[PDB]
Design a protein around this ligand. Structure first.
Ligand code: BHA
Length: 167
C-alpha cells in the first residue's frame, strides 16, 4: 500500500490522475518525482518551470552546479538530484523535444530511466510544450515502464481523452 489517492488504474503498474504534479508532490511527498527536463537542466517552462518555482528556485541552483560539474545530459537520459520540498528525490528525465527536431524513438529510452525506481510520480514524457502526441507518450510509458508509475496529467480535457482512447 502507498499514499497515492484518486488514480485510475490503466495496467498492473501504471496509474493516471487529472492533477497538478506540483500540488500532488506537495501532498504525497513521494520518494521520486520525475521532472520533464532538458539537457541543460534549464527549468524555464512547463513541468520543469512549475516544479522549480515550487522549490523557490533551489532546484535551478542545484541543477546549475550539476551541469557545471558534469556537462549536459543526453536526450533520453536522466540524473537523480534532490526533491527539495516536493519529494525525497527528483529524477530529471530528458524526453525528445519535437519542437527542436529530436528523434521520437528516444522517448522509449527516456521512459527506461523510470525502471531504476520502484515507485514514481511523473508527467507524460514529451507531452505539452515538448511537442509529442500525449496518446503516444502514454502508450510508450505502458509498454516500457515496469515499475509503479503514478501519472499526473495537468489538462482535464487531455486526461479525459487519454482515458477514453486507452487500449
Ligand atoms: N503547475 C503546472 C503543471 C504542469 C505543467 C505542464 O506544462 O505540464 C505546467 O506548465 C504547470
Amino acid at each position: 500500500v502507498n499514499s497515492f489517492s484518486g488514480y485510475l488504474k490503466l495496467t498492473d503498474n501504471v496509474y493516471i490522475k487529472n492533477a497538478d504534479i506540483v500540488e500532488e508532490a506537495k501532498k504525497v511527498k513521494p520518494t521520486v518525482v520525475v521532472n520533464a527536463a532538458n539537457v541543460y537542466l534549464k527549468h524555464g517552462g512547463g513541468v520543469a518551470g512549475a516544479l522549480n518555482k515550487a522549490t523557490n528556485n533551489a532546484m535551478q541552483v542545484e541543477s546549475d552546479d550539476y551541469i557545471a560539474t558534469n556537462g549536459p545530459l543526453k536526450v533520453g537520459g536522466s540524473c537523480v538530484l534532490s526533491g527539495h520540498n516536493l519529494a525525497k528525490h527528483c529524477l530529471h528525465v530528458v524526453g525528445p523535444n519535437v519542437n527542436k527536431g529530436e528523434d521520437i524513438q528516444l522517448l522509449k529510452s527516456a521512459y527506461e530511466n523510470f525502471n531504476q525506481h520502484e515507485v514514481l510520480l511523473a508527467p507524460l514524457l514529451s507531452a505539452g510544450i515538448f511537442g509529442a502526441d500525449p496518446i503516444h507518450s502514454l502508450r510508450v510509458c505502458v509498454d516500457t515502464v515496469r515499475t509503479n508509475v503514478y501519472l499526473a496529467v495537468f489538462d482535464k480535457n487531455l486526461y479525459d481523452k487519454l482515458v477514453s482512447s486507452f487500449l
